[PDB]
Design a protein around this ligand. Structure first.
Ligand SMILES: Nc1ncnc2c1ncn2[C@@H]1O[C@H](COP(=O)(O)OP(=O)(O)OP(=O)(O)O)[C@@H](O)[C@H]1O
Ligand SMILES: [Mg+2]
Lengths: 139, 101, 396, 61, 48, 102
């Protein structure tokens, strides 16, 4: 009976499903997510759903009929403000650019090196520089 | 800015020598300072250093050791880092500079 | 006319030295409040049906709210569903066909749409919140000086309601609409909170920014509803603080957002002096800048008295000090005249801030009795934001 | 038993104009057995070795 | 503070004031025929 | 195991009840009648469940109405705008007074 109950519990995540935004949490196993249909509903929450992905903007998935929070969908922020996708690489090698050895090293030392070798930064006691300003004559 | 809305209007002036030395000591607590690095002298080399510029000086002193693959910063690593962070832009024109006697 | 829904203020106790008689008066008020609570609770408990029950079964649950648009027959009507559609509904018997008027909010049966009630007092909750229910605790005795200014505001919003015979026996229409203008921190909003503490009429309050909305039709409609509520509630006072937000000088704006600003202003103008005369509703407007308001908004006929609040004079500043130091514990050496005589442009808010700061410097030195030095210090630690801007020694 | 008058149907009229009747389904042998063939696998199923490459990948994961 | 709390609770005990929904006097009531009007007549959508 | 399977079955039964609407309370209207404002629809003078004291139904609340009978059955936390809600600090910073000199 327990595997049966788990099976129908999984079945409630069948794939007629509307999506709504997780506005706010009331208490355990319930929510106030508003559906994309145009209305906000006071709903119930699956136990299987982990509550830590229920950030108060999540585009959670709702049951079509009972209109209950049945699934939390991963956020959609792939290219909101033109974040460089895998097909939008500039295709400019470091060796392609000529000279600029000091300028390359300073830039590489604040925006590329800290991401990879953070341990070496932390080993001295300095937080890596967060902003660089390249300036000079045009071109 | 009328009182009843803003009762206290607290000013944050640029830190003095005894204050800049303090900023140099809280932003270098985690830094592996050597022996003989007089933090007061570096503070004395920064007249009117805002307060974030002291942290920038500490960070650049550490950076001057990062490019050399070390963990300790010497006095010269700070003195050569003060001139970098505490850089100034001059008028670069005597004709404009002598507009006023 | 539902009558003036005046704010509920408890009786004041006026010993302020924390003596026993203060406790006696507060305990008297407490005993009466306890007796009123006993009355209501014991009325509910002591208190232990066929006619209205049939009506409630007929109406059912829920019960929609629509807008009446046409009374076709004595038993038939056309209403607009709250989405914007129309329906040829039937009028039921328990519905009173006199209150059924075009434009009013009618109750509709959910399953079979039909008029089953009239929803009077359907005021927008953005306007029902505008009404003051708990009166401010700042009486006219809490203001030092401004006797001329207080008298001007007292002859237009209180005297015409206590002694209308004086106005009617002479032939006047009492001043209806005053504007309170001056430097910041002089006592305009204080005067508004003071009249709200003494008036017996409903006191709607607005910052001149609640009545501005993103929607096209909501802006002017909200001011129309506010004035409709003010007229509905008998004598009324509408305090539009910071009127400079909406009522600025008109101009040919190339922005649609600003063109609605002038459009709701032009309805504030209409609701003040238009084709249909206003009711017994006074309007009190406040602004820090009278030179920026539209000439039509501050035009006589709409605003009759332009009460000016200049920076407090020496005597006015001395009275303001005593008003703000009444609850203090001043030392015997505290001669306030040292601070008043200074030519600095000290507003009343400046005086209150000096008093608070002077009290705080006493806590700095572990004292609950402020001395004269505390005041001389608080004057300097509080007199910022104005520095010293004046012409140099040109003039002799 | 077997039901509680639903709210979704009570407001449209229950025990007032029409009343529900308890539902019971006559299912007997020689009918269920034919129905179990919807997802019954076969003799081949149960002896297949899956795929060893993805089996190793899944085991490692 | 007791005065303030007492004022809060006493205004809570009676704040909800009756808002009548415009019912006609009982003399002009035809509930028996009103039910007939409710069941027989149907809501007609206004169209052009 | 019986407790676990019981919990699963009660969750399954409770999940099939339709989601309840949320609406702002304009004002109370009797002792058993509350005026509400469903978001897509308009006003509604709804009933109140026996488990809710009407004195707790203040104007501008966010009570929940049942899916079909439109019956008030919960007060629900008050509505704040989603953009004005992120302005409240939920994770305090890691800067202390000891890190400020001068
Ligand atoms: N004549 C006065 N007597 C007593 N207190 C005064 C007087 N004038 C001003 N104050 C004090 O000034 C404080 C500032 O509030 P107030 O209502 O006076 O501001 P305001 O002049 O309306 O401000 P704004 O121009 O910013 O709208 C009040 O709390 C009040 O105590
Ligand atoms: Mg003011």
């Amino acid at each position: 009976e327990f595997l049966h109950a788990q099976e129908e519990v999984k079945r409630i995540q069948s794939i007629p499903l509307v999506i709504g935004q997780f506005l706010e949490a009331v208490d355990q196993n319930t929510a106030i997510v508003g559906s994309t249909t145009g209305s906000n509903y006071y709903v119930r929450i699956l136990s299987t759903i982990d509550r830590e992905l229920l950030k108060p903007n999540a585009s959670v998935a709702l049951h079509k009929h009972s209109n209950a929070l049945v699934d939390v969908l991963p956020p959609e922020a792939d290219s909101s403000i033109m974040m460089l996708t895998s097909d939008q690489k500039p295709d400019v090698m470091y060796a392609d650019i000529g000279g600029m050895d000091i300028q390359k090293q300073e830039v590489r030392e604040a925006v590329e090196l800290p991401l990879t070798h953070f341990e070496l930064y932390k080993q001295i006691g300095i937080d890596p520089p967060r902003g660089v300003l390249m300036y000079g004559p045009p071109g | 800015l009328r009182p009843g809305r803003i009762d206290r209007k607290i000013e944050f002036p640029p830190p003095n020598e005894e204050a800049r030395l303090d900023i140099l000591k809280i932003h270098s607590r985690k830094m592996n300072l050597t022996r003989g690095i007089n933090l007061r002298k570096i503070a004395e080399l920064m007249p009117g250093a805002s307060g974030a510029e002291v942290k920038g000086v500490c960070t650049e002193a550490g950076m001057y050791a990062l490019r050399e693959r070390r963990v300790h910063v010497t006095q010269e690593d700070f003195e050569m880092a003060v001139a970098k962070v505490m850089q100034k832009d001059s008028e670069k024109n005597m004709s404009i500079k002598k507009l006023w006697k | 006319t539902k009558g003036p829904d005046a704010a509920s203020k408890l009786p004041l106790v006026t010993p302020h030295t924390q003596c026993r008689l203060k406790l006696l008066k507060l305990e008297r008020i407490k005993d009466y409040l306890l007796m009123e609570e006993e009355f209501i609770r014991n009325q509910e408990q002591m208190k232990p049906e066929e006619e209205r029950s049939k009506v409630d079964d007929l109406r059912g649950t829920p019960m929609s709210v629509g807008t009446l648009e046409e009374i076709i027959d004595d038993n038939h009507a056309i209403v607009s569903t709250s989405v914007g559609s129309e329906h040829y509904v039937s009028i039921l018997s328990f519905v009173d066909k006199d209150l059924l008027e075009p434009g009013c909010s009618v109750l509709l049966n959910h399953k079979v749409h039909a008029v089953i009630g009239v929803l009077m007092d359907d005021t927008d909750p953005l306007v029902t919140v505008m009404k003051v229910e708990k009166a401010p605790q700042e009486t006219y005795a809490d203001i030092g000086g401004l006797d001329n200014q207080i008298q001007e505001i007292k002859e237009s919003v209180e005297l015409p309601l206590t002694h209308p015979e004086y106005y009617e026996e002479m032939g006047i229409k009492p001043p209806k609409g005053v504007i309170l203008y001056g430097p910041p921190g002089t006592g305009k909003t204080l005067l508004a909170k003071a009249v709200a503490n003494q008036t017996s009429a409903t006191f709607l309050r607005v910052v001149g920014s609640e009545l501005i909305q993103k929607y096209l039709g909501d802006g002017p409609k909200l001011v129309r509803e506010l004035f409709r509520v003010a007229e509905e509630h008998a004598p009324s006072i509408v305090f539009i603080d910071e009127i400079d937000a909406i009522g600025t000088k008109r101009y040919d704006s190339n922005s649609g957002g600003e063109r609605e600003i002038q459009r709701t202003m032009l309805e504030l103008l209409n609701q003040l002096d238009g084709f249909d005369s206003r009711g017994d509703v006074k309007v009190i407007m406040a602004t820090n800048r009278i030179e920026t308001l539209d000439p039509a908004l501050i035009r006589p006929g709409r605003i009759d008295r332009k009460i000016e609040f200049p920076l407090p004079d020496e005597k006015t500043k001395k009275r303001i000090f005593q008003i703000h130091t009444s609850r203090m514990t001043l030392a015997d050496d505290v001669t306030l005249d040292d601070l008043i005589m200074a030519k600095d442009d000290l507003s009343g808010a400046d005086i209150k801030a000096i008093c608070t700061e002077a009290g705080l410097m006493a806590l700095r030195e572990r004292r609950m009795k402020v001395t004269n030095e505390d005041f001389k210090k608080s004057k300097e630690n509080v007199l910022y934001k104005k520095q010293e801007g004046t012409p140099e020694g040109l003039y002799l | 038993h077997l039901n509680k008058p639903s709210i979704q149907a009570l407001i449209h009229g229950l025990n007032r104009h029409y009343y529900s009747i308890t539902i019971n389904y006559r299912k007997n042998e020689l009918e269920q057995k034919m129905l179990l063939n919807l997802h019954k696998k076969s003799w081949m199923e149960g002896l297949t070795l899956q795929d060893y490459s993805e089996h190793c990948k899944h085991n490692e994961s | 503070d007791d005065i303030q709390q007492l004022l809060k609770k006493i205004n809570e005990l009676t704040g909800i004031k009756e808002s009548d929904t415009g019912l006609a006097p009982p003399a002009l009531w035809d509930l028996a025929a009103d039910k007939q009007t409710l069941q027989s007549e149907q809501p007609l959508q206004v169209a052009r | 195991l019986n407790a676990k399977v019981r919990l699963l079955r009660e969750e399954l039964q409770l999940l099939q009840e339709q989601g309840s609407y949320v609406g702002e309370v304009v004002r109370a209207m009797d002792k058993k009648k509350v005026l509400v404002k469903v978001h897509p629809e308009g006003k509604f003078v709804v009933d109140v469940d026996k488990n809710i004291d009407i004195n707790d139904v203040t104007p501008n609340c966010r009570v929940a109405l049942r899916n079909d009978s439109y019956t008030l059955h919960k007060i629900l936390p008050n509505k704040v705008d989603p953009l004005v809600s992120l302005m409240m600090v939920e994770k305090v910073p890691d800067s202390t007074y000891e890190m400020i000199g001068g």
